[PDB]
Each structure stands twice: as structure tokens, then as C-alpha cells.
Design a protein around this ligand. Structure first.
Ligand code: NI
Lengths: 246, 4
């Protein structure tokens, strides 16, 4: 399950303590310096199920297929009771992304033919592009992507290299904007994969756009348990704060 | 199932 790249990078092996209890990776790409920095290069290349981090691209696909459009991202909650209060309400793109509302994205994916998805995954080079698995191929199933690739895709998205409309990209960015300050925009998305009732796969990917640069990042956690997006985000924030990016 |  490995992404093969010979790209150079600055090693961040001193970030190891942040990853206590996990086989984790942190990948940073500094846009201005066109430079990667990586903690745990081997793990950086290992592809894992994206879980909710896939929602970023599923949203883009949905825009591209006009499932979503300007002033047209709402979905009404059918009153089905989910485990998370935030899912138990009407949604728009922002809320569905912030709260990782699976049903909203399942509803969008329903209108995407398998071949359309495959086409998009090819265009955006989404990891192994394998979607044979479950209907929810993005959730602890066949589709897997590495931390470095998560960064590459964010970068290609943000730089508008992807063949998605820029306004769609801006909408998706907004939907994953965690903090907007004068000094930076902090964008990120969690994912968590559960196997055997354990959190075994945690993601937090995003970027910090400052007044002069953009720092794309992906943190992955693998562990027997507790490897979840929340912890991945906590760790990411610790690192980004140590780096004085947020 | 998004409706639109
Ligand atoms: Ni629909």
C-alpha cells in the first residue's frame, strides 16, 4: 500500500514525541520553498483509508457533477437518528464538512457513478484509486491514500491545478476552514477509521495559509486504538504551534 | 439522496 516517490524532504525526526502511542507521520509542504518536511518518511508513504478526509474530494466531485453548486449545497435531514447530534439536523456544505456528516456525503456519492469517481480519482491521483471495496469505499475499505499524497492533493487543489472550478474549490476550502484570522487561514479535515471497535487510523490534513505562504500538512496516526482524527488534529496543532504557523 |  505504498506511494512511491523519490522527492527530497527535510527530516522532522524530532517530532517523534508528539506521536507517543502511534506509528504516525507528519508531512509538511512549504509552498514558497517548494519543500517537503516529513516526520516518519516510511509512514508518510503508506496509504491508509482516508475516511472523512475523502469528503473534501467527494465534495469537489459533487460540485463538478453539479450535484452541489452555488447556493445549492443543502440537504434536509430525513429525521433518521444518528449517534452525533451534529448529524441530526439539516446540513449544508459547511456543516456537513465541519461535522463530517456521513449521510450528506453518502447522498452525494449516490449520484456519482463508479466510473465517474474512478475518472476523478485518476485525475487527482487519489492514492491507490481503488474503489472496489464497500459502497463506502472511502471508509476503512479499498481506497487508500498516503500522508504525502494527502498533502499533494491539498496543494494541487489550493493551487488550482485540479480540474475543478475555482469557485467550487473556494467553497470546499470554506467548508473546512477551522480558523480565519488576519494572519492566517487554517483549514483542515479529520478522518477516523474504526476496526474491531478500535480507532486504528486517524487523519488530520489541511493547510495554514499565511500572508506570504501556505503550509500544507497531513498527520496520520496508526495504532491499535485511539488513532483518530481528533488526536491527529491535536497533534497537528501542537506541531503547527511549535512551528509558529498557528 | 441529496434531492437538490
Ligand atoms: Ni441526491
Amino acid at each position: 500500500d505504498k506511494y512511491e516517490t523519490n522527492v527530497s524532504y527535510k527530516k522532522l525526526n524530532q517530532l517523534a514525541p508528539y506521536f507517543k502511542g502511534f506509528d504516525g507521520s507528519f508531512v509538511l509542504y512549504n509552498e514558497r520553498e517548494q519543500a517537503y518536511s516529513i516526520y516518519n518518511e516510511p509512514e508518510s508513504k503508506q496509504r491508509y483509508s482516508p475516511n472523512s478526509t475523502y469528503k473534501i474530494y467527494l465534495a469537489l466531485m459533487a460540485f463538478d457533477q453539479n450535484l452541489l453548486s452555488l447556493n445549492h449545497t443543502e440537504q434536509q435531514w430525513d429525521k433518521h437518528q444518528y449517534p452525533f447530534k451534529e448529524w441530526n439536523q439539516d446540513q449544508n456544505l459547511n456543516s456537513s464538512m465541519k461535522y463530517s456528516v456521513n449521510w450528506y456525503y453518502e447522498n452525494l456519492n449516490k449520484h456519482l457513478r463508479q466510473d465517474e469517481v474512478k475518472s476523478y480519482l485518476d485525475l487527482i491521483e487519489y492514492g491507490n484509486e481503488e474503489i472496489s471495496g464497500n459502497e463506502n469505499y472511502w471508509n476503512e475499505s479499498s481506497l487508500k491514500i498516503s500522508a504525502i499524497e494527502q498533502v499533494n492533493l491539498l496543494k494541487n487543489m489550493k493551487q488550482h491545478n485540479m480540474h475543478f472550478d475555482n469557485k467550487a474549490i473556494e467553497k470546499v476550502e470554506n467548508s473546512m476552514t477551522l480558523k480565519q484570522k488576519d494572519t492566517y487561514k487554517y483549514v483542515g479535515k479529520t478522518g477516523t477509521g474504526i476496526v474491531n471497535h478500535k480507532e486504528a487510523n486517524g487523519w488530520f490534513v489541511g493547510y495554514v495559509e499565511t500572508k506570504d505562504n501556505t503550509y500544507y500538512f497531513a498527520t496520520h496516526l496508526k495504532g491499535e486504538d485511539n488513532a483518530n482524527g481528533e488526536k491527529a488534529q491535536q497533534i497537528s496543532e501542537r506541531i503547527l504551534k511549535e512551528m509558529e504557523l498557528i | 439522496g441529496h434531492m437538490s
